[PDB]
Amino acid sequence: HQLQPRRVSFRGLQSPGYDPSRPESFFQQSFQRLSRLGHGSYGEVFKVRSKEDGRLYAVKRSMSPFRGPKDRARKLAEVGSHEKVGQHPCCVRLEQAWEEGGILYLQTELCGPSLQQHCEAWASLPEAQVWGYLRDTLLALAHLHSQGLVHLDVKPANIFLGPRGRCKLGDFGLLVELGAGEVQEGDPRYMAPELLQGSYGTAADVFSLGLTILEVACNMELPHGGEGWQQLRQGYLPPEFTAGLSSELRSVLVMMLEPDPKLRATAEALLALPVLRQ
Numbered sequence: 612h613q614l615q616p617r618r619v620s621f622r623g624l625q626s627p628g629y630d631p632s633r634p635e636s637f638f639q640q641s642f643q644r645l646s647r648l649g650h651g652s653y654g655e656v657f658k659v660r661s662k663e664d665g666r667l668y669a670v671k672r673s674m675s676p677f678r679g680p681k682d683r684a685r686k687l688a689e690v691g692s693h694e695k696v697g698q699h700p701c702c703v704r705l706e707q708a709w710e711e712g713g714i715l716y717l718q719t720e721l722c723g724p725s726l727q728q729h730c731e732a733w734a735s736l737p738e739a740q741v742w743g744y745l746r747d748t749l750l751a752l753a754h755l756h757s758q759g760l761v762h763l764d765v766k767p768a769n770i771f772l773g774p775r776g777r778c779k780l781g782d783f784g785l786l787v788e789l790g791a792g793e794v795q796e797g798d799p800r801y802m803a804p805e806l807l808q809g810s811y812g813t814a815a816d817v818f819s820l821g822l823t824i825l826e827v828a829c830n831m832e833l834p835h836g837g838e839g840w841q842q843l844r845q846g847y848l849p850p851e852f853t854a855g856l857s858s859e860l861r862s863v864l865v866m867m868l869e870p871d872p873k874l875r876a877t878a879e880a881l882l883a884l885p886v887l888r889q
């Protein structure tokens with residue numbers, strides 16, 4: 612026998628068309644699986660339609676049952692972090708989460724391709740689009756920081772194309788609160804230099820978003836270490852990466868890539884620039 616699905620929430624499961632008497636899972640009974648959006652060691656993401664309301668969503672499920680109470684605690688923690696983010700037009704919105712059969716499910720709004728996928732199936736993007744992605748993801752960071760939260764893995768793969776040129780930031784598994792809480796290793800290509808010393812704060816996201824946007828704007832791989840990695844963290848843009856970048860975009864990126872986090876521009880300061888108006 613199998614225990615009924617349980618809602619996972621850190622704030623305070625039954626749905627139309629779900630029958631506990633029937634053997635198959637809440638996920639099998641309550642959704643129509645339409646396509647697979649992604650698969651990895653983190654599990655799988657599916658595009659689904661909900662039987663409850665008839666609308667499209669995405670559902671991420673973990674790959675293997677919990678191995679022990681700590682493994683379970685650490686996986687469920689993602690839901691608590693995501694709930695702290697809440698509703699914001701530039702953040703992937705969690706609808707509900709649940710556990711069944713030792714598997715964790717997160718149901719969110721359905722978003723488009725990641726910025727990474729969008730780039731791969733474009734070369735270098737029109738700068739007008741890049742400005743939109745930068746602005747939207749800056750709004751997301753201002754929102755996170757207002758909640759005392761820092762995303763420690765801002766990267767092209769974690770930003771999803773919404774409606775009409777809009778970007779939403781997601782994957783809040785590596786969110787920390789301003790103690791910190793347990794966290795995994797962010798992608799070294801986009802890592803703020805102060806994180807080498809374990810120092811973090813709202814500035815670390817801004818730096819990562821700077822290299823995220825640099826990468827999508829120039830369509831070149833960033834170094835994961837060695838001299839190239841250091842030379843992106845000196846306070847200038849290496850010419851290697853700047854071919855075809857406008858003077859306007861270059862200047863905003865260099866504000867975001869300031870190595871001293873005390874000097875680095877805040878999301879709100881960047882959003883107040885005339886170039887990022889509206």
Ligand SMILES: Cc1ccc(O)c(C)c1-c1cc(-c2ccnc(N3CC[C@@H](N)C3)c2)cc(C(N)=O)c1N
Nearest residue numbers: 648649656669670671717719721722723781782783
């Ligand atoms: C379901 C879910 C729950 C919580 C959450 O925060 C997010 C973002 C999602 C979510 C994830 C994905 C997706 C697709 C392919 N690869 C990845 N990953 C690659 C590695 C990892 N970092 C990110 C993620 C797509 C969508 C979407 N298109 O609607 C989506 N809403």
